[PDB]
Amino acid sequence: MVDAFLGTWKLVDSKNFDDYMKSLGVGFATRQVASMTKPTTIIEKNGDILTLKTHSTFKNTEISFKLGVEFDETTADDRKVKSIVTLDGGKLVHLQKWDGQETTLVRELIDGKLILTLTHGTAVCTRTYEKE
Numbered sequence: 409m410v411d412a413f414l415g416t417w418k419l420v421d422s423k424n425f426d427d428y429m430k431s432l433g434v435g436f437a438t439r440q441v442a443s444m445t446k447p448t449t450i451i452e453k454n455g456d457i458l459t460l461k462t463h464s465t466f467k468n469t470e471i472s473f474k475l476g477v478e479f480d481e482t483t484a485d486d487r488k489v490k491s492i493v494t495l496d497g498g499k500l501v502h503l504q505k506w507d508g509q510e511t512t513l514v515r516e517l518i519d520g521k522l523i524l525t526l527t528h529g530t531a532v533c534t535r536t537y538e539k540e
C-alpha cells in the first residue's frame with residue numbers, strides 16, 4: 409500500500425527549507441551547507457517494516473519502522489524525538505514529537521515526483537524528489 413513510494417529518489421527542488429531549519433533552531437553554518445546539499449532518499453520495505461535512508465555529502469540518516477507503531481528517532485539535526493509514520497489519504501505522514509513540539513514530514517506522489525512537505529511552527533517547506 410506504500411509500494412509506489414519505494415525506490416531511490418534524488419532532490420530536484422527545494423522551497424523554504426531555510427525557514428524550516430531556522431524554525432527547528434538549526435545554526436546558520438549547518439543551514440548554509442544544507443541549502444546546497446542534494447540528498448538521495450532510499451525507501452525499502454521488508455514485510456511491514458520500512459527503512460528510509462537519507463544520504464548526502466553532509467549528513468546521513470536511516471530509520472526503520474512499522475507503519476502505525478511509534479519509534480524513537482534521532483534526527484539529522486540531533487533532535488531526540490518520538491515518531492510515528494502512517495498512510496493517510498495515500499500520503500506517507502511522519503510525525504515527530506519532542507518537548508511538546510511537533511513537526512510533520514508528509515510525502516505524496518504527484519505526476520511521478522515525490523513531494524515532501526515539512527511543517528514546523530509556521531514554516532512550510534516543499535522539497536521535490538525524482539526517481540532514480
Ligand SMILES: CCCCC/C=C\C/C=C\CCCCCCCC(=O)O
Nearest residue numbers: 442447462464467468469484485535
Ligand atoms: C540527512 C540529509 C540531511 C540534509 C540536510 C543537512 C542537515 C540537517 C539539517 C536539518 C534537518 C531537518 C530534518 C532533516 C530533513 C531532511 C529533509 C529531506 O529529506 O530532504
